[PDB]
Amino acid sequence: DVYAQEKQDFVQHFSQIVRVLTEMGHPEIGDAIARLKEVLEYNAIGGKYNRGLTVVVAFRELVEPRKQDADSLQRAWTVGWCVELLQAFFLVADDIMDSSLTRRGQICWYQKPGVGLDAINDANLLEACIYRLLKLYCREQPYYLNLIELFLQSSYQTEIGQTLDLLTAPQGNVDLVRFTEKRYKSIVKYKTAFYSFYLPIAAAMYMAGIDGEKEHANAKKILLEMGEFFQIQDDYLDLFGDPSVTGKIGTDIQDNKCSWLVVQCLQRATPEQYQILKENYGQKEAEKVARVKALYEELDLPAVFLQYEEDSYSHIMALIEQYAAPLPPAVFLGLARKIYK
Amino acid sequence: DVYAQEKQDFVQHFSQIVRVLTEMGHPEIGDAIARLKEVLEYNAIGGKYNRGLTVVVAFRELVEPRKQDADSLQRAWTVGWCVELLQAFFLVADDIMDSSLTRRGQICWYQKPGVGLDAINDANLLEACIYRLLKLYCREQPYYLNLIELFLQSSYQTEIGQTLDLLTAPQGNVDLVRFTEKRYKSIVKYKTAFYSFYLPIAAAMYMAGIDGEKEHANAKKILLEMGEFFQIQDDYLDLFGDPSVTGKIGTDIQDNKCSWLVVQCLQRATPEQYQILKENYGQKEAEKVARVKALYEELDLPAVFLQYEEDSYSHIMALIEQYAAPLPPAVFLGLARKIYK
Numbered sequence: 040d041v042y043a044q045e046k047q048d049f050v051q052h053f054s055q056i057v058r059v060l061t062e063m064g065h066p067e068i069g070d071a072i073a074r075l076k077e078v079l080e081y082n083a084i085g086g087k088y089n090r091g092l093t094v095v096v097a098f099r100e101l102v103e104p105r106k107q108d109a110d111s112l113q114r115a116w117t118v119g120w121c122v123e124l125l126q127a128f129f130l131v132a133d134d135i136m137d138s139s140l141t142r143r144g145q146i147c148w149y150q151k152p153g154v155g156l157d158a159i160n161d162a163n164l165l166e167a168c169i170y171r172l173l174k175l176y177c178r179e180q181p182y183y184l185n186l187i188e189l190f191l192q193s194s195y196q197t198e199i200g201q202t203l204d205l206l207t208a209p210q211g212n213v214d215l216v217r218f219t220e221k222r223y224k225s226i227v228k229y230k231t232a233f234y235s236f237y238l239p240i241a242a243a244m245y246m247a248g249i250d251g252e253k254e255h256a257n258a259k260k261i262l263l264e265m266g267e268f269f270q271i272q273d274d275y276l277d278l279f280g281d282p283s284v285t286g287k288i289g290t291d292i293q294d295n296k297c298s299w300l301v302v303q304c305l306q307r308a309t310p311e312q313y314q315i316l317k318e319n320y321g322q323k324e325a326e327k328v329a330r331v332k333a334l335y336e337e338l339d340l341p342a343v344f345l346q347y348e349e350d351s352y353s354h355i356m357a358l359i360e361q362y363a364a365p366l367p368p369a370v371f372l373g374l375a376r377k378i379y380k
Numbered sequence: 381d382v383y384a385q386e387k388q389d390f391v392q393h394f395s396q397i398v399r400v401l402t403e404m405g406h407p408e409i410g411d412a413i414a415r416l417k418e419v420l421e422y423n424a425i426g427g428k429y430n431r432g433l434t435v436v437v438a439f440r441e442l443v444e445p446r447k448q449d450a451d452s453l454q455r456a457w458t459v460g461w462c463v464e465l466l467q468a469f470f471l472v473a474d475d476i477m478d479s480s481l482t483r484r485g486q487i488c489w490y491q492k493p494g495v496g497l498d499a500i501n502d503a504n505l506l507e508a509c510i511y512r513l514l515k516l517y518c519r520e521q522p523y524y525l526n527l528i529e530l531f532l533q534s535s536y537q538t539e540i541g542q543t544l545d546l547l548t549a550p551q552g553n554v555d556l557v558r559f560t561e562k563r564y565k566s567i568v569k570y571k572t573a574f575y576s577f578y579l580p581i582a583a584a585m586y587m588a589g590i591d592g593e594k595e596h597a598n599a600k601k602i603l604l605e606m607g608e609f610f611q612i613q614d615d616y617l618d619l620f621g622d623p624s625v626t627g628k629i630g631t632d633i634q635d636n637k638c639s640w641l642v643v644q645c646l647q648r649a650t651p652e653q654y655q656i657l658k659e660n661y662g663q664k665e666a667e668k669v670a671r672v673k674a675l676y677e678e679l680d681l682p683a684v685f686l687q688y689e690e691d692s693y694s695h696i697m698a699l700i701e702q703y704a705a706p707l708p709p710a711v712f713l714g715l716a717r718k719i720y721k
């Protein structure tokens with residue numbers, strides 16, 4: 040299991056990441072750096088690390104082993120951690136915006152006592168640490184500027200998607216008319232697919248000298264289609280998954296979210312079916328949640344998902360056959376096997 | 381008035397800034413871009429634009445007029461606007477953290493109805509726009525990477541200071557023991573001086589080919605000492621200024637802030653004077669505010685400020701005489717004349 044082999048060394052490298060981001064020439068800022076230590080430890084640790092590890096795995100698959108020295112690996116781990124800090128920045132902030140209670144089975148940072156909206160500044164420091172790391176480890180490298188720009192573009196794309204999400208589903212203002220498929224695909228593309236699929240692979244490519252605009256265009260065609268499928272999967276499993284399988288528990292309906300399900304549900308309705316969803320979707324009560332689930336069931340939406348999963352598997356295989364070269368197909372396929380739940 | 385000459389053209393260029401940051405190949409994100417237009421217009425417009433204009437004025441003073449073509453000026457205006465967007469990013473967010481009501485005599489963005497904590501994402505888009513602008517206007521230039529890194533370093537330094545501020549004065553937890561001078565100088569240095577004084581001049585230098593580590597070290601020695609003085613000035617004027625002069629009205633005492641005044645006040649106290657400040661500083665009531673002001677008065681703190689202003693003027697002149705070369709002294713002096721209130 041190629042990801043499980045690399046994990047040990049990756050998660051150990053965190054010690055050094057934090058040591059270096061807090062390494063004492065200016066004793067005056069001690070107290071803020073301490074706080075920075077605390078923010079990293081609480082927010083970068085505890086996930087599965089899929090995105091970060093994809094950098095280290097791709098790097099191994101993309102570089103000639105002759106050219107995989109100790110330095111090269113330190114940089115790969117670091118850039119991997121950069122991806123993880125990006126995620127930490129987004130999540131700290133999104134949890135504030137969504138009024139979330141927990142994240143990874145523990146209290147969101149901003150809910151922790153004495154933190155509150157100070158978390159906004161903490162999220163910003165998380166983003167800042169990316170560019171500090173890139174500079175400490177990669178300034179002298181020929182791909183240095185490509186990475187800076189790739190992280191920046193990835194932040195912008197994610198923010199644009201978050202904006203589009205916030206527009207599509209305002210807390211307190213339940214409206215289903217703007218839960219369209221065109222709109223769903225866009226949110227997923229910008230809000231998750233880009234930084235979760237494209238970014239880690241693309242960081243790997245750059246680090247191995249692969250900076251062709253055509254090569255990157257091709258990786259991206261594949262990786263976006265992948266990330267779309269994997270988000271639709273999570274939406275499905277949110278409801279119809281056993282929570283032993285998932286790890287979450289499915290609040291998408293109480294939270295009035297733009298899930299793939301409710302979208303597809305919306306397309307397959309006599310006018311009278313809409314009124315039941317208007318009535319039930321978003322409410323605290325549990326009997327209400329049940330009537331929504333029963334509804335999606337009586338529209339054989341599993342059958343619709345199953346069909347989507349077939350077609351999607353076929354298309355992605357085709358893409359990989361057509362556009363992976365000159366990359367090894369196992370960079371894409373290994374990712375798919377790792378994220379499939 | 382060198383700043384008043386450049387203002388017209390600078391503020392007109394905003395039209396183009398916004399046109400370009402919202403310029404339609406991807407119709408799917410229309411709705412988020414619209415929102416981006418709205419965020420820029422509300423948050424980048426309405427200030428004095430000192431920081432932004434310092435880029436355009438310095439550029440004129442630093443480049444040989446032969447080499448000040450139409451392109452060169454577009455880039456100067458743009459980078460100026462980049463500074464202004466940085467400010468917009470910080471202020472949108474700081475207003476959330478401080479639970480501010482108004483900013484520039486109007487409702488803070490996050491208080492505007494339908495915005496709320498969505499403003500966090502909006503602040504982030506403001507930061508993102510800097511790097512989009514830098515790329516659209518400067519990618520091909522030899523100073524491109526220096527600007528990217530300068531903006532990033534400036535964000536980090538500001539955030540670190542904001543962290544140190546948040547630590548020093550927690551809303552709800554009034555403690556004066558950590559309002560020390562060493563701590564005050566640090567907050568000002570990182571939170572304001574760097575990005576308000578050093579950054580705009582340094583962006584100008586880079587754009588004119590001045591990338592020496594020694595030249596930048598020297599500009600910075602001057603500009604930090606300047607920014608320190610100008611913040612101490614604002615603290616003073618917050619209380620002892622006529623508000624016809626200032627434009628603000630002095631809430632620093634109700635808001636339990638780490639002002640230069642309260643700091644210096646703390647150093648000049650029998651133990652019994654502290655108890656009056658413990659008692660009065662931070663409270664809603666007005667009679668309480670008065671007893672604080674009366675206190676600072678009876679410690680001849682104007683006399684202490686006056687002395688500080690003399691010594692400070694002398695030191696800054698000395699710095700400029702010693703370290704401005706090979707820059708023209710009028711870049712520093714013009715800045716001082718523009719910001720002195």
Ligand SMILES: O=P(O)(O)C(Nc1ncnc2sc(-c3ccc([C@@H]4CC4(F)F)cc3)cc12)P(=O)(O)O
Pocket residue numbers: 265268345348349351352353355356375376379380
């Ligand atoms: O037990 P499930 O996972 O629910 C089962 N699924 C499968 N069963 C046997 N082979 C495959 S191969 C496969 C699959 C793998 C990857 C992908 C997407 C393309 C990718 F890799 F991104 C899509 C479908 C699913 C799949 P079903 O729901 O089809 O009954």
Ligand SMILES: O=P(O)(O)C(Nc1ncnc2sc(-c3ccc([C@@H]4CC4(F)F)cc3)cc12)P(=O)(O)O
Pocket residue numbers: 372374375376377379
């Ligand atoms: O009886 P098999 O079909 O061979 C069964 N397979 C599965 N069963 C229930 N869900 C999934 S999902 C799945 C799967 C996931 C990803 C992929 C493709 C390689 C990749 F990860 F892109 C192919 C198949 C297989 C798979 P087994 O492998 O446990 O024997």
Ligand SMILES: O=P(O)(O)C(Nc1ncnc2sc(-c3ccc([C@@H]4CC4(F)F)cc3)cc12)P(=O)(O)O
Pocket residue numbers: 606609686689690692693694696697716717720721
């Ligand atoms: O009417 P105020 O402004 O209050 C008056 N101030 C001055 N009066 C006549 N010349 C100068 S030159 C001067 C000054 C200018 C710049 C600076 C700081 C160095 C810098 F430029 F950054 C410090 C002091 C103040 C100053 P006072 O408070 O000293 O009575």
Ligand SMILES: O=P(O)(O)C(Nc1ncnc2sc(-c3ccc([C@@H]4CC4(F)F)cc3)cc12)P(=O)(O)O
Pocket residue numbers: 713715716717718720
């Ligand atoms: O009677 P003057 O001393 O000549 C009087 N000057 C001032 N009066 C009250 N506040 C200030 S603050 C001030 C000032 C500010 C900045 C500077 C130095 C050049 C710089 F902006 F660094 C020098 C003096 C002069 C100044 P005027 O200029 O209106 O005639």
